[PDB]
Amino acid sequence: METTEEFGNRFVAAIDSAGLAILVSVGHQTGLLDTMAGLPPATSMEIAEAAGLEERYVREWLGGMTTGQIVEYDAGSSTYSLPAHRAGMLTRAAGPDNLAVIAQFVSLLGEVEQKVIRCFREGGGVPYSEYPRFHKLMAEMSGMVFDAALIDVVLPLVDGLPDRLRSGADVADFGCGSGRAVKLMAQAFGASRFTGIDFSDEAVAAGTEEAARLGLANATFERHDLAELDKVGAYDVITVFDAIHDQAQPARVLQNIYRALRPGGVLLMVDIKASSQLEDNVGVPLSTYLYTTSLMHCMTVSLALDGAGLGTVWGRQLATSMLADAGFTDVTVAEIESDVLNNYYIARKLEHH
Amino acid sequence: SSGLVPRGSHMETTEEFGNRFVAAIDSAGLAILVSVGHQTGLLDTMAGLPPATSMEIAEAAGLEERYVREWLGGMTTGQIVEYDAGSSTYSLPAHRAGMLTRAAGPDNLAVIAQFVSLLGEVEQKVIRCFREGGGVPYSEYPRFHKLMAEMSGMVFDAALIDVVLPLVDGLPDRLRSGADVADFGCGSGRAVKLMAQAFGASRFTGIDFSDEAVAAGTEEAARLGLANATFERHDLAELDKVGAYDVITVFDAIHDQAQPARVLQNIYRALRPGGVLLMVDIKASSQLEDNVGVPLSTYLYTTSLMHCMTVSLALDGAGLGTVWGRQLATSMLADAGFTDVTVAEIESDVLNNYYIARKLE
Numbered sequence: 001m002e003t004t005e006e007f008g009n010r011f012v013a014a015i016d017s018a019g020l021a022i023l024v025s026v027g028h029q030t031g032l033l034d035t036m037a038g039l040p041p042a043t044s045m046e047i048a049e050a051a052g053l054e055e056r057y058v059r060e061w062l063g064g065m066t067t068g069q070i071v072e073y074d075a076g077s078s079t080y081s082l083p084a085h086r087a088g089m090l091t092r093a094a095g096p097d098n099l100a101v102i103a104q105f106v107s108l109l110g111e112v113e114q115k116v117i118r119c120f121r122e123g124g125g126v127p128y129s130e131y132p133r134f135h136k137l138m139a140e141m142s143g144m145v146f147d148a149a150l151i152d153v154v155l156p157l158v159d160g161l162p163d164r165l166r167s168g169a170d171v172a173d174f175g176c177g178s179g180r181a182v183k184l185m186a187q188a189f190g191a192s193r194f195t196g197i198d199f200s201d202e203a204v205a206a207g208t209e210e211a212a213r214l215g216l217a218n219a220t221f222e223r224h225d226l227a228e229l230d231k232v233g234a235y236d237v238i239t240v241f242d243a244i245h246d247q248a249q250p251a252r253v254l255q256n257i258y259r260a261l262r263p264g265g266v267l268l269m270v271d272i273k274a275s276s277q278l279e280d281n282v283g284v285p286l287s288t289y290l291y292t293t294s295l296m297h298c299m300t301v302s303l304a305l306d307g308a309g310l311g312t313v314w315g316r317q318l319a320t321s322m323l324a325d326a327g328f329t330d331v332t333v334a335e336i337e338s339d340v341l342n343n344y345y346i347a348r349k350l351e352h353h
Numbered sequence: 354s355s356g357l358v359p360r361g362s363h364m365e366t367t368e369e370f371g372n373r374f375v376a377a378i379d380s381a382g383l384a385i386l387v388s389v390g391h392q393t394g395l396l397d398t399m400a401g402l403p404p405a406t407s408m409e410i411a412e413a414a415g416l417e418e419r420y421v422r423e424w425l426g427g428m429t430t431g432q433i434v435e436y437d438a439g440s441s442t443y444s445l446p447a448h449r450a451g452m453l454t455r456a457a458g459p460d461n462l463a464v465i466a467q468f469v470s471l472l473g474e475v476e477q478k479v480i481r482c483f484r485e486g487g488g489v490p491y492s493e494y495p496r497f498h499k500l501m502a503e504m505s506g507m508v509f510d511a512a513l514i515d516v517v518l519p520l521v522d523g524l525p526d527r528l529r530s531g532a533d534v535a536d537f538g539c540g541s542g543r544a545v546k547l548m549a550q551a552f553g554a555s556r557f558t559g560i561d562f563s564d565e566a567v568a569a570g571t572e573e574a575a576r577l578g579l580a581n582a583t584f585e586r587h588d589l590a591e592l593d594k595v596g597a598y599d600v601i602t603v604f605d606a607i608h609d610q611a612q613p614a615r616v617l618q619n620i621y622r623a624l625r626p627g628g629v630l631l632m633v634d635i636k637a638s639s640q641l642e643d644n645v646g647v648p649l650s651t652y653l654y655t656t657s658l659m660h661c662m663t664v665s666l667a668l669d670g671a672g673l674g675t676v677w678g679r680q681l682a683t684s685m686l687a688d689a690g691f692t693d694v695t696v697a698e699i700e701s702d703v704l705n706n707y708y709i710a711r712k713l714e
């Protein structure tokens with residue numbers, strides 16, 4: 001059993017780690033981690049000169065980074081270094097493997113703590129519009145992942161899908177945001193016809209503009225509320241990348257996806273890998289982060305519209321049964337070894353007319 | 354590490370760092386959940402319940418069940434709350450409730466957990482200062498200052514009268530007989546209230562640069578009938594006090610001054626010959642290498658960067674920061690004219706050194 005002293009030490013260490021996460025976030029947004037990755041052991045003043053930043057701020061940052069045992073400090077020379085084995089997963093050189101990106105979510109969630117606490121008392125939720133910086137960062141992260149992996153890694157999970165897209169299909173991306181997924185697919189698959197759907201006017205406008213700029217005649221964008229969608233047998237392929245669990249009306253959205261698919265069509269839904277049973281998530285890395293992100297964003301945004309409030313950790317078992325309730329009788333869950341965060345749900349609609 | 358060379362310590366691998374950093378992200382989330390549990394009274398509620406459902410916990414706390422459920426999820430994966438899948442019941446083990454609830458007094462670690470969101474709220478402002486210099490003004494931190502008073506208040510209620518004041522040989526006797534006492538950088542006036550209640554024969558003045566702290570203290574005095582407690586608004590860097598006080602106390606105010614050396618000079622001047630300064634400030638070394646590995650060090654450098662240092666730099670100040678340290682504190686006491694200085698420590702407050710500085714008679 002854990003003692004009072006052991007727990008006290010463990011929680012104090014958690015306090016220090018929360019602080020360290022904020023320092024890493026600052027080091028990412030300032031460019032200090034990138035700067036340090038390109039330098040030999042250097043003084044605070046040297047690092048600040050190289051970074052283009054105020055030395056007094058750099059100095060205090062380095063101090064916490066050193067007590068956190070990320071940055072290494074030699075008292076003899078007053079020099080600091082970022083060892084290469086840490087630098088690799090904390091810098092922009094790593095693209096979407098840059099773990100420092102995730103650290104930014106600590107402040108983003110902290111910014112809404114007081115609003116979220118109020119909802120414990122008064123109900124409702126914090127509206128979607130309160131989180132613009134959070135949404136911008138999420139779109140940037142998904143963008144980088146799509147650039148790295150959508151065409152060559154993700155779509156080939158679905159047996160026969162690349163050939164289907166090469167031959168030419170009608171494809172829709174539901175909750176398309178920026179339109180990065182639509183743009184990449186429209187470039188890779190000239191014979192296919194792609195529609196991004198989103199309820200954000202700004203998203204739709206942006207996608208349309210980006211298509212026009214690239215001369216992508218096969219990429220179009222439409223504003224719809226996915227819960228009110230009207231489309232019957234329009235698409236061979238529907239993709240949904242993290243756009244179900246935040247929904248006000250997830251069951252209706254899923255039913256509308258089923259209805260929008262042609263007989264013989266396929267849904268690729270990408271969403272968060274977790275169990276619907278709490279006990280299974282204990283001890284899995286990032287579980288606490290996922291429940292916290294849920295409480296403070298994904299769940300509360302849905303509850304702000306009197307929605308379902310399924311949350312980020314809605315989990316595989318519930319996702320699978322909700323796909324069944326939507327009409328899908330053929331559902332497979334794929335995983336990629338290097339992706340611990342997402343499940344890839346492949347739901348096929350029967351060919352019967 | 355090839356396996357071919359003896360090394361003084363474990364060389365951490367890319368993988369192992371990955372796992373450590375991910376666990377830090379989880380720990381940050383857990384801190385936020387504990388902060389939320391403190392502010393909602395959920396930790397307190399659970400501490401006087403047997404194992405219970407999400408619905409039962411919500412009912413007992415008077416809160417929305419859907420929020421409590423998601424909270425309980427994260428508290429369980431963070432291994433604070435325990436979940437029994439057989440009965441769908443949650444419980445807060447007593448050994449943990451003993452340091453996460455108001456009833457634990459000065460051992461309630463849920464209080465410091467509130468810092469994460471508070472520093473999170475200013476992160477973007479602080480990042481701007483890395484590029485543009487200056488700092489984030491003190492007025493950007495209204496809630497963070499309530500945290501500060503909650504934290505200091507735990508130590509004051511537990512230790513001020515019976516442990517702290519007795520650290521100065523003969524001070525309690527002097528106070529019982531009657532002395533003139535000032536608390537510089539007083540805040541809400543918790544310490545002044547406790548002293549004036551304990552020592553009816555002594556006169557106590559709280560001084561702070563906030564008019565509503567001053568009027569808070571002043572109201573609370575008339576409301577409690579403490580005629581021997583008063584409060585005055587001044588900036589500590591510009592005072593006309595000369596031989597006004599037998600005793601001056603300063604609790605965690607020196608290191609965030611714009612002009613700390615000037616403030617210490619003013620304290621020296623304000624003391625009568627043979628008087629005493631009790632300066633309580635953060636326990637740490639002025640040498641970075643000494644702080645590596647000490648619990649709460651990263652927390653201290655982080656709060657410094659994002660509050661204590663930046664508020665001083667906002668005023669074109671010294672920016673000594675939270676971790677200014679024992680060596681610099683002692684030399685700055687020397688510079689200000691204090692030739693007799695001892696550093697004490699107490700069990701009820703791991704975060705602070707108690708500097709006792711005497712002015713020659």
Ligand SMILES: Nc1ncnc2c1ncn2[C@@H]1O[C@H](C[C@@H](N)CC[C@H](N)C(=O)O)[C@@H](O)[C@H]1O
Nearest residue numbers: 139142175176177198199200225226241242243
């Ligand atoms: N009810 C809705 N109807 C249409 N779009 C919605 C609805 N609810 C949320 N959204 C959009 O769904 C997207 C949710 C995003 N998290 C997914 C964005 C995108 N697929 C990505 O991977 O970056 C946002 O662009 C929202 O504007």
Ligand SMILES: Nc1ncnc2c1ncn2[C@@H]1O[C@H](C[C@@H](N)CC[C@H](N)C(=O)O)[C@@H](O)[C@H]1O
Nearest residue numbers: 502505538539540561562587588589604605606
């Ligand atoms: N230059 C100044 N003049 C007057 N007060 C100041 C000055 N600089 C900082 N402060 C005050 O210093 C106090 C610093 C607090 N950390 C301590 C409050 C209180 N002594 C406590 O232990 O809770 C705040 O109440 C500020 O209002």
